[PDB]
Design a binder for this molecule. Structure first.
Ligand SMILES: Cc1cc2nc3c(=O)[nH]c(=O)nc-3n(C[C@H](O)[C@H](O)[C@H](O)COP(=O)(O)OP(=O)(O)OC[C@H]3O[C@@H](n4cnc5c(N)ncnc54)[C@H](O)[C@@H]3O)c2cc1C
Ligand SMILES: Cc1cc2nc3c(=O)[nH]c(=O)nc-3n(C[C@H](O)[C@H](O)[C@H](O)COP(=O)(O)OP(=O)(O)OC[C@H]3O[C@@H](n4cnc5c(N)ncnc54)[C@H](O)[C@@H]3O)c2cc1C
Ligand SMILES: NC(=O)c1ccc[n+]([C@@H]2O[C@H](COP(=O)([O-])OP(=O)(O)OC[C@H]3O[C@@H](n4cnc5c(N)ncnc54)[C@H](O)[C@@H]3O)[C@@H](O)[C@H]2O)c1
Ligand SMILES: NC(=O)c1ccc[n+]([C@@H]2O[C@H](COP(=O)([O-])OP(=O)(O)OC[C@H]3O[C@@H](n4cnc5c(N)ncnc54)[C@H](O)[C@@H]3O)[C@@H](O)[C@H]2O)c1
Lengths: 153, 153
């Protein structure tokens, strides 16, 4: 059992792709995440998992809020941008939802207030209560086996 | 803000589909789950999220272990089965990995020991340390907007 074997295995679980956003003292910060899930119905809770070394970790710890932007099929470049994979950052179009910066034309936008924070090995889980939601009927960006994919139409 | 709006939103995050399995007195229990994610690299941690009213909850609390079986495209019937959606249960073919019952021909099989248990609203998060992994190169069953889907080929 290598780290590569584990990552390969984990990559067998297909997911959508989100960008996590928050605002700290004026500035908008974003991070590409697929470790996201729906947690609870009553109350409305959601969870995101952030690596210990990630700049986003301290940002969320201070702001105590975050939004989750589910990316559409047309937003592959944004995924790469917020994953630190482009040499030059793109000029991202933000709007607002429940007091959070959200990404324009995202498949879906979900704004949260952090209600719990749980360390789990390498990462921290931020459990958030959902305050606002915006949905569209776009097709999703998918991530599977280390590659970007689309739904069969 | 209705429960339907929240569920619709949450459905906008595409996922693979797993069956969580465990063993209590040699009886094998399974439950369909898509609230699953990779958590930590060092140590190797995974997380699953189980509803407070789910029979699986108490089973895992006792056994202190679970396997995650990621379903292939060919396993839609299994997903429906372990979701309580068929009138008559199907005869499921089990095998073994790390002392856990796993589903034969799954896309991937991941066996875990529970290392933490965190309540989060409606649900409990069982954080699991991975002991054993088996992977194949099959295509995944997908779940998105309340429907089963496939990857574009
Ligand atoms: C598909 C995929 C899924 C991933 N899932 C997760 C996961 O769930 N959990 C996890 O911890 N990591 C995940 N990662 C890795 C993570 O996205 C990167 O490690 C990321 O670079 C870490 O961001 P950071 O907070 O450390 O800050 P940085 O490394 O600085 O942020 C990454 C990039 O975002 C850009 N950026 C930030 N804010 C803005 C803005 N205001 N406008 C324009 N650009 C901006 C920056 O230019 C930078 O290049 C994933 C990566 C991929 C590709
Ligand atoms: C795609 C999708 C994703 C879901 N994700 C989640 C989630 O992540 N978290 C969550 O809590 N719920 C989730 N659910 C709901 C969950 O799958 C159902 O609520 C399930 O019925 C609850 O199982 P239970 O533990 O309460 O026991 P039951 O309701 O009794 O189990 C469901 C079915 O599994 C069958 N079964 C169990 N063991 C065996 C076996 N040994 N051999 C053959 N059949 C067996 C039973 O016949 C039963 O019909 C999801 C449902 C769907 C369709
Ligand atoms: N922290 C995360 O939850 C996470 C998820 C995906 C990618 N990433 C990071 O982004 C970079 C690019 O990703 P890639 O194209 O190599 O995809 P990849 O092939 O490494 O990812 C496939 C799967 O492996 C798992 N994984 C990868 N890194 C992980 C980590 N650090 N902690 C927990 N699970 C992890 C995830 O479940 C992911 O979906 C890599 O450095 C990777 O580590 C991190
Ligand atoms: N507990 C869960 O994480 C979960 C996830 C999916 C489906 N289910 C249950 O299985 C049954 C059939 O599912 P469906 O075909 O109606 O799909 P659906 O349209 O209700 O599911 C779409 C999304 O909504 C979210 N969701 C649904 N029920 C949830 C719950 N009880 N708690 C937290 N998030 C939830 C999930 O993220 C899911 O991916 C429903 O009763 C549903 O509640 C539960």
């Amino acid at each position: 059992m290598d780290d590569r074997l584990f990552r390969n295995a984990m990559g067998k679980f297909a997911t959508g792709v989100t960008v996590i956003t928050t605002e700290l003292n004026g500035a908008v910060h974003g991070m590409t995440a697929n470790a996201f899930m729906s947690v609870s119905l009553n109350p409305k809770l959601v969870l995101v998992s952030i690596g210990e070394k990630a700049k986003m970790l301290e940002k969320i710890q201070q702001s105590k809020k975050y939004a989750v932007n589910i990316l559409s099929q047309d937003q592959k470049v944004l995924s790469m941008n917020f994953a630190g994979q482009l040499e030059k950052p793109v000029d991202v179009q933000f709007e607002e939802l429940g007091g959070l910066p959200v990404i324009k034309d995202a498949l879906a936008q979900i704004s949260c207030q952090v209600v719990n924070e749980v360390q789990a090995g390498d990462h921290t889980l931020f459990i958030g209560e959902v305050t606002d939601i915006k949905i569209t009927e776009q097709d999703p960006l998918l991530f599977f086996s280390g590659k970007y994919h689309q739904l069969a139409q």
